[PDB]
């Protein structure tokens, strides 16, 4: 601006937000995780079990056969191709997403690995170790190992290098964001899975009815090398009213809880004083030592390393160890399976002992009421698994299976004397199917709901679905609640209203998920700067040292934590340590935790430093920076590039996660909180908090909301539940989900005729493209009690406005059909069947089909019309209802249009599937015009259906002649307290009168009084009231009507897709009761609650008729001797018989529901005899 | 997708003013409020018709025709 060092304002923060979204986008987490997995994780997985060795020993049978062979298969580098598809005839070509969607193909690339096949041989002289030598056979080629589905708009996809024009050529929408997969032609989004972080000690309290009072648990996890989890639990047995409370730890593969002292001695610390020194780090904390004395007393009889190890070993579940391999067995368990996340190599007992003491110390601190039990809902202890890690574990499992198959083939080839064919040893189908099956379904194996069909109802729906997270609900916590740690990380308003309330979360706009990096460089850096190793740490000679943790591993201690943290922070800010790395300094606890693992959710914040030039703390970002941010923003529409990364590398913004958020002070705004320190009565009361130690500042408070809540105008003037309702409902509004809807064949699609952009908009909406792809219209809304047809959440719509096109939409439905081949003999074809050669032809009309069995686009269709004609051949010697003559050789397998739907055929495409069979897609157009059953909503939870429609001359009018497009009841306002609805109408009224876009972002300086002054400047009543006239008589209404524009949305629920009645119709095969489903002419359920109500009414005969004549009614014949339905009745011959009873004259007929007959027969199958009798044997 | 022919509320013809509206915005450097009044749109029902319209047909025209003559 003027000075490149002047402080910025709250308006300049939106330039920073704009830069953030220019660099990242809205689906950054999906693309970033996949790119990391494909780039780095795939190579790592194959470099874990790359070597497979098959040793053929001497097999001493004769001295002419004394050589021992060793065959080795090793995997080298892995290569990935571009997406491709192989046809039935064996031709492979590049596949683009548009063709994959239309042809039901999977968008995937191929994986290749370099394989080295070595063979050594050695002379097996008896009773000697061998010297294997390479026998001059080292073959070294690329081997196909399967196909990897490719996420769209990723590094390996064809659309990452495409410009806007290129996307248009490829029939792709520029507004499309990617982040999903195409499996069998279906768009699938991977929902992030929420889990609890590993390698963190957590201390919990147990209820009264349990011998254990406290338990410190750590789910040890190693991110690289084996992926298996082993849990260690340290339990404090006994209650507070006991005379002896000891501590016992659970080790893997030991079957029993060992006293902690025994474990310490097994690690090499025999002196009791040293053990206590490892647990308690203060020599005068006698209260903690007093609680430790019982432990050292329990394990007194063991006083050396070997006896302790044998004590551990005999508890182990191996029973192959005899008595002498049993000490080593315990030693190996303590080395490779005890606390694996520190290390698994020989010679690190000191680290294990110190960490075990650390866990015990935390357990005792909580047991002594010095610490509170760890909060399970703390969002900083949670991890979100994205597509990257999810595909990583799936691939790890599948590659293990592939390698196992490879060796089994090697062994089988060596024994059964066959030739080795590398084409059969490696089955590429293993990788291809496992990834396809897991992505087609949600079943992550060989967890559910991990993959869902991406919503494409509207643009906002797609964006929200691509940023959802899930939490699988025995647990002791309240995970459904909105925790404090959720601030600025997940939207506080967007959650389902059903059983998923609080379990399905949505990321905030500026939220991000880390991909994780290598912790080794940081550990090496710490070692060079004075992080004294943990092998020489004497707690009693340094009772001020800070413990240094890296990914939950206690690596050492530091004498000057302050300088180390300063050096670490400066390195991260200038760009030597990855910004995703989280650094926390718990000054009181004397701990320094560094986190580098993947799955931590973080968000950016401004950095606040002293800058003594002004004498008070201020943001590092100045107006000079903001000037160049916007200069680069507008030069695109050439100064040096200056992006979000430049802010990050210059130390002006900082990524912060929930755990690091515990040690910082944040200012809501730089306007008032940063400056050292009449008022407008209309402005809200803002609390200063008068703190002079701020370390960071919010970019803007509005970014705490998600995609769905960022469309709400003035969400801070609404009751919170209304914001939640709108977040859910905004995903059901018709709009323009994509600009290429005329080249896509979706199952269903709704397109608004004339989408408008809201008069009252939000600044966050600038990045959601709601102005380019809006979902709704600006209707002139009056809040009045006009005719009583808007009572109880209904509305009156203007028929004249409907006639002109208000809220009118297109509806598209696609029908799919294939030419199946039932083996080698029976095959189908698309045909126009004739009534003389085809059986079971539908009662509809085939007049619109062509010779290929398809209706040409542009033809109008209606109910029962056949749009895809198909026939299949039949087997002879099967006659149904007569009507089956030698002329008939085909049967109808046609596809009719939906019974209730009609329209015009819009598009017909014919192509071939992966297997080369012909299949077609037919799309039908129809226009939906608002009627008296359609649902409409505003952006404030106010939804309703049209009660009635009126023409313009019947509606209430103003002196200017303006009539409402929509009338809602005043009674909808008070109880719901949706004040934002009324503020939006006032703002939109001013916006239309002045020709501007109203600013409705939540936390701003805009007040109702300011809008009122603007409205009065335009010659209108300041509060939005107008004098209206009755349309029937023309007289003034005694009251004045709140009247102005409001953004309404047409929802997905239309009555014409719900109305359905049934007199009689098809029945189910099993129970012979009305079928389920409106689409199948089904009936309605007269359930148990309805039965109870009719019992309360005393309508016995009506209850019987509903259950008998309106549903299954069946007549059976029962025997008078045995009450079984075993009577063979020849009703034509008037003969009855119950063989077994040898009677023909004691038969009765009863009327029971067919389900009752089914029930009794099922009981008969279970050897139960329900005998129905027509007379009583006992008195009441 | 394309400009509505009539105002929804009152039915005044507004589909013959889109190009005039755009030309006023571009070449005359007028603010949208002044342009709306210069076109004769006085009632705010008509102003929001032209002020909130999104021209999607321009996006649809970027795709090559399905069937060329």
């Amino acid at each position: 601006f003027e000075d490149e060092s002047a402080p910025i304002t709250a308006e300049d923060s939106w330039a920073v937000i704009s830069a953030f979204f220019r660099e990242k986008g809205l689906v950054s987490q999906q693309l970033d995780s996949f790119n990391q997995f494909v780039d780095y994780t795939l190579q790592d997985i194959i470099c874990e079990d790359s070597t497979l060795i098959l040793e053929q020993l001497a097999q001493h049978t004769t001295e002419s056969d004394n050589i021992s062979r060793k065959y080795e298969i090793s995997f080298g580098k892995i290569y990935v191709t571009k997406p491709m598809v192989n046809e039935s005839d064996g031709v492979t070509h590049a596949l683009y997403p548009q063709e994959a969607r239309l042809r039901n193909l999977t968008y995937s690339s191929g994986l290749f690995v370099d394989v080295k096949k070595r063979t050594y041989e050695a002379i097996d002289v008896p009773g000697r170790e061998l010297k294997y030598e390479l026998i001059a056979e080292e073959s070294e080629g690329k081997v196909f190992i399967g196909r990897l589905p490719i996420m769209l708009r990723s590094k390996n996809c064809y659309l990452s290098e495409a410009t806007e024009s290129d996307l248009y050529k490829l029939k792709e929408c520029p507004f499309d964001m990617g982040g999903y997969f195409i499996i069998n032609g279906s768009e699938k989004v991977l929902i992030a899975q929420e889990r609890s972080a590993g390698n963190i000690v957590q201390v919990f309290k147990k209820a009264a009815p349990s011998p254990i009072s406290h338990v410190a648990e750590i789910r040890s996890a190693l991110e690289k090398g084996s992926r298996f989890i082993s849990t260690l639990q340290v339990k404090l047995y006994g209650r507070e009213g006991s005379s002896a409370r000891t501590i016992k730890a659970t080790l893997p593969y030991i079957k029993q809880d060992i006293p902690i002292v025994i474990i310490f001695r097994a690690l090499g610390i025999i002196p009791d004083g040293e053990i206590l020194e490892h647990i308690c780090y203060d020599v005068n904390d006698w209260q903690m030592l007093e609680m430790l004395k019982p432990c050292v007393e329990d394990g007194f009889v063991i006083q050396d390393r070997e006896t302790a190890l044998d004590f551990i070993g005999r508890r182990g579940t191996a029973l192959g160890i005899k008595k002498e391999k049993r000490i080593q067995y315990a030693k190996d368990i303590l080395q490779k399976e005890f606390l694996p996340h520190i290390t698994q190599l020989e010679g690190f007992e000191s680290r294990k002992a110190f960490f075990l003491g650390y866990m015990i110390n935390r357990l005792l601190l909580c047991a002594l009421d010095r610490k509170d039990q760890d909060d399970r809902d703390h969002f900083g202890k949670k991890r979100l698994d994205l597509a990257g890690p999810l595909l990583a574990q799936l691939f790890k499992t599948l590659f293990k299976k592939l390698t196992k198959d490879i060796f089994r083939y090697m062994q089988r080839t060596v024994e059964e004397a066959h030739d080795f064919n590398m084409k059969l040893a490696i089955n590429a189908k293993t990788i291809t199917s496992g990834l396809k099956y897991a992505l087609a379904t949600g079943n992550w194996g060989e967890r559910a709901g991990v993959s869902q069909v991406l919503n494409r109802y509207t643009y906002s729906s797609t964006l929200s679905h691509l940023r959802r997270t899930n939490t699988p609900i025995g647990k002791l916590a309240k995970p459904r609640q909105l925790h404090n740690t959720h601030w600025g990380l997940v939207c506080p308003a967007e959650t389902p209203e059903g059983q998923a309330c609080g379990l399905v979360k949505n990321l905030s706009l500026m939220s991000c998920i880390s991909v994780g990096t290598d912790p080794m460089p940081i550990i090496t850096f710490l070692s060079e700067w004075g992080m004294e190793p943990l092998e020489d740490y004497v707690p009693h000679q340094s009772p001020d040292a800070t413990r240094v943790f890296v990914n939950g591993v206690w690596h050492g201690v530091h004498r000057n934590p302050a300088r180390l943290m300063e050096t670490l922070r400066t390195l991260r800010r200038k760009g030597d340590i990855n910004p995703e790395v989280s650094m926390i300094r718990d000054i009181r606890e004397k701990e320094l935790k560094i986190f580098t693992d993947a799955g931590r959710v973080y968000r950016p914040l401004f950095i606040v430093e002293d800058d003594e030039s002004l004498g008070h703390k201020e943001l590092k970002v100045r107006k000079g920076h903001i000037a160049k941010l916007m200069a680069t923003e507008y030069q695109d529409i050439d100064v040096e590039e200056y992006t979000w990364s430049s802010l990050l590398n210059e130390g002006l913004v900082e990524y912060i996660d929930a755990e690091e958020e515990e040690s910082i002070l944040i200012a809501m705004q730089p306007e008032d909180l940063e400056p050292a320190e009449d008022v407008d009565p209309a402005k809200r009361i803002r609390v200063s908090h008068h703190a002079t130690t701020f370390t960071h500042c919010e970019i803007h408070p509005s970014m705490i909301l998600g995609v769905a809540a960022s469309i709400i105008p003035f969400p801070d003037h609404n009751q919170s539940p209304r914001n939640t309702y709108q977040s859910a409902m905004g995903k059901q509004a018709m709009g323009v989900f994509l600009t290429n809807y005329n080249v896509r064949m979706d199952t269903m699609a709704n397109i608004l005729y004339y989408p408008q952009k809201p008069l009252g908009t939000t600044r966050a909406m600038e990045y959601l493209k709601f102005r380019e792809l809006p979902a709704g219209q600006n209707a002139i809304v009056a809040i009045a009690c006009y005719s009583g047809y808007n009572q109880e959440d209904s509305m009156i719509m203007n028929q004249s406005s409907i006639d002109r096109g208000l809220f009118r939409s297109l509806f598209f439905r696609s029908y799919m059909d294939q030419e199946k081949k039932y083996g080698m003999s029976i095959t189908e074809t698309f045909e126009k069947p004739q009534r003389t050669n085809t059986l079971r032809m539908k009662h509809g009309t085939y007049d619109k089909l062509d010779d290929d069995g398809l209706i040409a686009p542009g033809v109008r269709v209606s109910g029962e019309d056949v749009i895809i004609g198909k026939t299949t051949p039949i087997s002879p010697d099967e006659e149904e209802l007569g009507q089956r003559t030698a002329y008939h050789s085909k049967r109808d397998a046609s596809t009719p249009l939906r019974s209730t739907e009609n329209g015009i055929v819009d598009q017909v495409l014919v192509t071939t599937n992966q297997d080369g069979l012909k299949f077609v897609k037919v799309r039908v157009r129809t226009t939906k015009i608002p009627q008296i059953g359609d649902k409409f909503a505003s952006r404030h939870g106010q939804k309703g259906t049209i009660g009635i429609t009126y023409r313009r001359e019947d509606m209430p009018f103003t002196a200017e002649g303006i009539v409402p497009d929509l009338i809602i009841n005043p009674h909808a306002i008070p109880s719901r307290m949706t004040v934002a609805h009324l503020i939006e109408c006032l703002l939109s009224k001013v916006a239309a009168l002045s020709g501007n876009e109203g600013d409705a972002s939540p936390f701003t300086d805009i007040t109702v009084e300011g809008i009122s002054k603007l409205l009065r400047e335009h010659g209108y009543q300041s509060r939005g009231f107008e004098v209206m006239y009755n349309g029937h008589t023309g007289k003034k209404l005694m009251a004045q009507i709140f009247f102005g524009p409001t953004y309404y949305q047409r929802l997905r629920h239309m009555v014409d897709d719900k109305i359905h009645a049934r007199a009689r119709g098809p029945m189910q095969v099993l129970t012979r009761q009305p079928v389920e489903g409106r689409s199948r002419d089904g009936g309605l359920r007269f359930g148990e609650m309805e039965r109870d109500c009719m019992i309360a009414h005393g309508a016995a005969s009506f209850l019987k008729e509903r259950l008998m004549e309106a549903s299954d009614a069946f007549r059976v014949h029962i025997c008078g001797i045995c009450g079984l339905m075993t009577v063979i009745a020849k009703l034509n011959h008037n003969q009855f018989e119950c063989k077994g009873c040898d009677n023909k004259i004691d038969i009765y007929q009863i009327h029971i529901p067919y389900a009752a007959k089914l029930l009794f027969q099922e009981l008969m199958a279970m050897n139960i005899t329900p005998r129905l009798y027509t007379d009583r044997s006992r008195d009441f | 997708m394309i400009v509505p022919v009539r105002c929804f509320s009152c039915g005044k013809v507004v589909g013959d003013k889109w190009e005039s509206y755009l030309n006023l915005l571009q070449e005359d450097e007028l603010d949208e409020g002044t342009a709306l009044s210069r076109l004769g749109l006085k009632r705010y029902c008509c102003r929001r018709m032209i002020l909130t319209h999104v021209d999607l047909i321009e996006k649809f025209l970027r795709y090559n025709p399905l069937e060329k003559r």
Partner: peptide, 19 residues
Amino acid sequence: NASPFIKRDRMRRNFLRMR
């Protein structure tokens, strides 16, 4: 007491002009 309008159409022109 504030400008309740998102001014985008010509504020880009103002900044582009200022430079």
